[PDB]
């Protein structure tokens, strides 16, 4: 294999460690980019949590057939004679999801701070 994948060729394999460590060189890719890197962490968390949040309510009448069957089968619920519609269920699931969305906003603001 005459061709080389990386020009630098510093090492045969690259090791990645989860812990940050006490001392490390910052590195250079264009330092101004690292301002975006701190901001991206809450943005990434909010987008993922928002998508998870929206998917629970995505459909009722035709789609979300499996969810509808699972909800109907459970024993605790009463026959729903009084109200045909079920928004309250949709509101209830998407209400718990936003607590994670809001606390991810606070925690990933803390991740932005590097304290």
């Amino acid at each position: 294999m005459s061709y080389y994948h990386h020009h630098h060729h510093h090492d045969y394999d690259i090791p990645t460690t989860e812990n940050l460590y006490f001392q490390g060189a910052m590195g250079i890719l264009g330092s101004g980019q690292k301002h975006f890197e701190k901001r991206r962490n809450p943005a990434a968390g909010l987008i993922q949590s928002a998508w998870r949040f929206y998917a629970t309510n995505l459909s009722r009448t035709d789609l979300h057939s499996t969810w509808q069957y699972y909800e109907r089968t459970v024993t605790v619920p009463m026959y729903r004679g009084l109200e045909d519609l079920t928004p309250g269920l949709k509101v209830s699931i998407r209400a718990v999801c936003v607590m994670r969305f809001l606390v991810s906003k606070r925690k990933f603001k803390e991740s932005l701070r590097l304290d």
């Binding site: 991206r40 943005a43 209830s92 209400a95 969305f101 809001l102």
Partner: protein, 148 residues
Amino acid sequence: ADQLTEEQIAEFKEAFSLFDKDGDGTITTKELGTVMRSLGQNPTEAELQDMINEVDADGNGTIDFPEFLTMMARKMKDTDSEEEIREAFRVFDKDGNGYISAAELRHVMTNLGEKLTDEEVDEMIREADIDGDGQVNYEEFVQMMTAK
């Protein structure tokens, strides 16, 4: 200046009505766990404590209506003012022209912030009917989040 919205408050009040279950008029951490189980989820007690941290000015260990209203209302400010989610998409744009490459989009969503598997990022692409080519616009995602 503008009058507060009663129709949106009514959704919040129904959620509050459902959420209280020991029936004392206020929602505590173990009731939130009780709601979670009823949605098929059994999170850790520490998680239930942590996800409540936001809600209260004074930290009263149980959630009163305006604080519950603020928790529910806070999401509405993102819906009403869509600037936060719109800007949250914007910080990932590699070229600055409003179109984001598909290959770039998968790695920064999957491996960063909250971590989600390939099957979960498939739903975001497919259910919004995004095209095979690299240019993906993110304005449509904000509009999908806010139009309905």
